[PDB]
């Protein structure tokens, strides 16, 4: 047969890549030596092509101009702070240790200093639950309880743009425009709508998968399609 | 549209040109490589044993 679409993907050809050259900024936590002493003023609010959500342009005291992953409620003129002794206000960034429990956080680091990994999409947020001298437990947007190093920096508040998913695309044209801003091949032809040569589910005189859809985790690329290592399927039971 | 005559009329692009190294009109001006002598690809001259019968 021929390599399936999932295999063409990995080659990183133009069709499968994201329009990086059109992307604005790699929104990471500003690095501070120590002491915390660092603040900046929100100069503007911009649209982020890579995330379909707003982003704040912030100018710091030392003269550094950088785009920031803006939480909800941040506006031009506001003063944001970043450091161990930062003020516990929305928009400020400080390690999980200095962040009081029960407070919503976003753009959490996985390893102290990485610049932020978790809770970065529209409207989401992580819940800071437990404190300790060794570990700070956080509840990520997926519902998973994540034990983290209390030194991991994080921003206060929920990511701006919440509710984006509430409105339907309505028509293909709208999807088209969004897709064009991401690293994704669209539209999607169903495997079952292809020829045997093109996909495991292809062929037949009528459209239906060959074998069952639940495929073993050990399946090789070219065959791993359908329901990857599903613990169950359907809605009932 | 036919792949034949009708599709021939758009062919006004220049690719293969006289090669600075070998003199053959095979220097692909887009790729900057000579399909005949390998100029632009290798210091050594392009040559292959299959260019002649195995016993020659």
């Amino acid at each position: 047969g021929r390599r399936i679409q999932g295999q063409r993907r990995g080659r990183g050809t133009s069709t499968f890549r994201a329009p990086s050259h059109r992307y604005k900024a790699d929104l990471e936590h500003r690095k501070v030596e120590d002491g915390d002493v660092i603040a900046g003023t929100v100069v503007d609010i911009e649209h982020d092509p890579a995330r379909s959500a707003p982003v704040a342009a912030v100018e710091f005291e030392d003269g550094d101009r950088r785009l920031i992953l803006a939480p909800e409620g941040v506006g031009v003129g506001d003063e944001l702070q970043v450091g161990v002794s930062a003020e516990i206000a929305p928009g400020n960034t400080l390690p999980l240790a200095e962040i009081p429990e029960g407070v919503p956080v976003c753009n959490v680091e996985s390893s102290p200093g990485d610049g932020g990994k978790f809770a970065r999409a529209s409207g989401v947020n992580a819940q800071l639950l437990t404190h300790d001298r060794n570990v700070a437990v956080v509840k990520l947007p997926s519902g998973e309880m994540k034990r983290l190093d209390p030194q991991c920096r994080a921003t206060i508040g929920v990511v701006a743009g919440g509710g984006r998913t509430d409105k339907p695309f309505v028509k293909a044209g709208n999807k088209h425009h969004k897709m064009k801003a991401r690293g994704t091949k669209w539209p999607n032809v169903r495997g079952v709508a292809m020829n045997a040569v093109d996909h495991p589910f292809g062929g037949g005189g009528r459209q239906h998968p060959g074998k069952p859809k639940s495929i073993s985790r050990n399946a090789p690329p070219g065959r791993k399609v359908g329901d990857i290592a599903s613990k169950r399927t359907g809605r009932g039971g | 549209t036919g792949a034949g005559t009708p599709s021939q009329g758009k062919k006004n692009t220049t690719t293969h040109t006289k090669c600075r190294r070998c003199g053959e009109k095979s220097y692909h001006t887009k790729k900057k490589v000579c399909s005949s002598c390998g100029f632009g690809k290798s210091a050594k001259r392009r040559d292959y044993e299959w260019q002649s019968k195995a016993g020659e």
Binding site: A53, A70, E72, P104, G161, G162, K167, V170 | -
Partner: protein, 73 residues
């Protein structure tokens, strides 16, 4: 407000579009001053036509349910 869609898309689609856009187009009280002068500038971007306060908020609402929770705690 989904009349631009004519007889296409079905109830749900154009019904939720009309709502989301209605509440989006509503007069919004600016956080800076107090006047109902906040208009959407783009996806998640809002601004007061009075004091010029430009700020971030929900994609279609200037403030989201989870956004209000932030203040509280």
């Amino acid at each position: 407000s989904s009349g631009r869609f004519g007889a296409r898309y079905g109830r749900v689609s154009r019904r939720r579009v009309a709502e989301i856009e209605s509440e989006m187009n509503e007069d919004h009280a600016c956080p800076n001053c107090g006047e109902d002068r906040v208009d959407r500038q783009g996806t998640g971007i809002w601004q007061c036509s009075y004091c010029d306060y430009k700020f971030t908020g929900g994609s279609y609402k200037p403030e989201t349910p989870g956004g209000k929770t932030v203040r509280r705690s």
